[PDB]
Amino acid sequence: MFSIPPLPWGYDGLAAKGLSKQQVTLHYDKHHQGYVTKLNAAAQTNSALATKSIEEIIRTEKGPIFNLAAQIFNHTFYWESMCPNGGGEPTGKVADEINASFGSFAKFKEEFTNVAVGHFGSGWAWLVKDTNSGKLKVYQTHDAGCPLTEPNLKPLLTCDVWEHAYYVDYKNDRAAYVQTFWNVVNWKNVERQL
Amino acid sequence: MFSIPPLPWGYDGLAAKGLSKQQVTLHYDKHHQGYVTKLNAAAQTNSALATKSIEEIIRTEKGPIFNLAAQIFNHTFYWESMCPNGGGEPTGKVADEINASFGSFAKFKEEFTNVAVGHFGSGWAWLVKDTNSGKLKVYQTHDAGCPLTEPNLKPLLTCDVWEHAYYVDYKNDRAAYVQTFWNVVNWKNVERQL
Ligand SMILES: [Fe+2]
Numbered sequence: 001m002f003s004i005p006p007l008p009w010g011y012d013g014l015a016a017k018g019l020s021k022q023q024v025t026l027h028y029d030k031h032h033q034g035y036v037t038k039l040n041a042a043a044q045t046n047s048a049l050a051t052k053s054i055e056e057i058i059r060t061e062k063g064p065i066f067n068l069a070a071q072i073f074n075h076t077f078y079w080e081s082m083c084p085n086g087g088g089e090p091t092g093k094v095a096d097e098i099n100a101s102f103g104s105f106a107k108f109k110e111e112f113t114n115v116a117v118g119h120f121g122s123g124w125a126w127l128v129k130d131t132n133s134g135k136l137k138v139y140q141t142h143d144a145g146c147p148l149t150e151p152n153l154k155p156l157l158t159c160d161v162w163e164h165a166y167y168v169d170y171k172n173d174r175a176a177y178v179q180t181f182w183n184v185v186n187w188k189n190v191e192r193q194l
Numbered sequence: 195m196f197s198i199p200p201l202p203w204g205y206d207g208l209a210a211k212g213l214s215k216q217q218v219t220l221h222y223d224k225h226h227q228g229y230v231t232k233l234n235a236a237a238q239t240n241s242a243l244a245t246k247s248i249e250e251i252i253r254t255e256k257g258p259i260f261n262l263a264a265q266i267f268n269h270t271f272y273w274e275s276m277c278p279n280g281g282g283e284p285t286g287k288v289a290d291e292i293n294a295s296f297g298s299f300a301k302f303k304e305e306f307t308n309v310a311v312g313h314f315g316s317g318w319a320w321l322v323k324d325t326n327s328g329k330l331k332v333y334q335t336h337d338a339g340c341p342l343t344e345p346n347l348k349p350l351l352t353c354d355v356w357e358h359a360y361y362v363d364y365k366n367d368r369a370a371y372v373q374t375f376w377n378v379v380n381w382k383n384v385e386r387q388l
Pocket residue numbers: 027031075160162164165
């Protein structure tokens with residue numbers, strides 16, 4: 001049956017950097033695990049699904065079943081995109097590729113910030129590498145939208161901007177939440193996805 | 195400049211019935227009033243907007259400006275759809291129209307509940323009247339979607355199911371929040387909209 005990996009850094013791992021044990025706990029135990037529970041129920045009454053992976057489902061299914069699998073993938077990628085020892089600017093190959101695609105880190109950061117803060121309704125802000133060209137791009141998905149449906153767009157980083165991701169700690173202030181996201185970006189994970 | 199009417203029953207009006215001073219205050223002062231502030235900002239940039247009514251903007255504009263006006267209307271309709279002395283089962287005209295369209299109040303309640311609880315992402319659950327047939331229907335919109343963009347459709351009632359509407363008091367439990375909505379439904383307002 002479907003399961004998800006534990007938080008890489010534990011329920012309180014980001015508390016000192018502005019995502020509280022309580023915010024993270026609700027987000028993981030209620031929202032993320034809830035999607036897993038719902039997908040497992042759906043597989044009992046849709047036998048085709050029991051043999052598909054999360055990724056296979058995202059690529060081949062649509063509607064509510066897609067939303068469950070995609071939300072599972074997106075949330076796991078989101079926790080892996082954050083780290084208590086992250087933040088600041090990337091170095092090495094990640095820095096090189098960001099500079100080549102966006103001009104500078106500051107320009108990349110402005111574009112991602114404005115997309116993340118400006119996304120209307122529930123969604124996800126992404127950094128992706130478009131393997132059609134090699135160029136990095138800022139990209140947003142709506143609701144459970146997942147870059148895997150556009151197979152050229154390799155995911156590097158995501159920030160959940162569903163209100164449930166930040167409302168506990170930040171209430172309506174998504175801008176403040178995104179500033180916090182920058183303080184915890186896991187550049188090591190981004191480098192692994194290149 | 196654009197403005198919104200005050201809450202009909204005060205910031206703490208629904209607290210005894212399950213929507214707290216804090217939940218309602220954030221929702222009205224930050225989100226609802228926030229949309230008004232943003233629309234007025236847009237109107238200084240574009241003077242043609244400033245003379246249009248909220249409903250005119252909803253019918254004619256698209257994109258971000260639409261989202262602002264539609265959210266302004268949807269939220270006012272939402273506050274008018276609730277009342278501390280409401281809840282329970284309607285009587286008179288509204289009851290007759292609900293019974294004629296859905297068979298019974300119980301059947302209507304079950305349909306509206308399931309649409310409201312099941313809406314994926316940000317959105318709104320509505321009771322509307324088709325003005326061609328007079329028949330009432332449960333109708334959902336996504337994000338800022340508003341029944342006024344559809345032909346021959348009059349809004350009667352709405353429940354906001356964006357996560358900010360319930361996350362302070364209910365967190366992930368939207369089902370519990372919708373049960374609370376049922377305890378405050380303003381059937382007097384629905385009667386005025388028939
Ligand atoms: Fe989330």
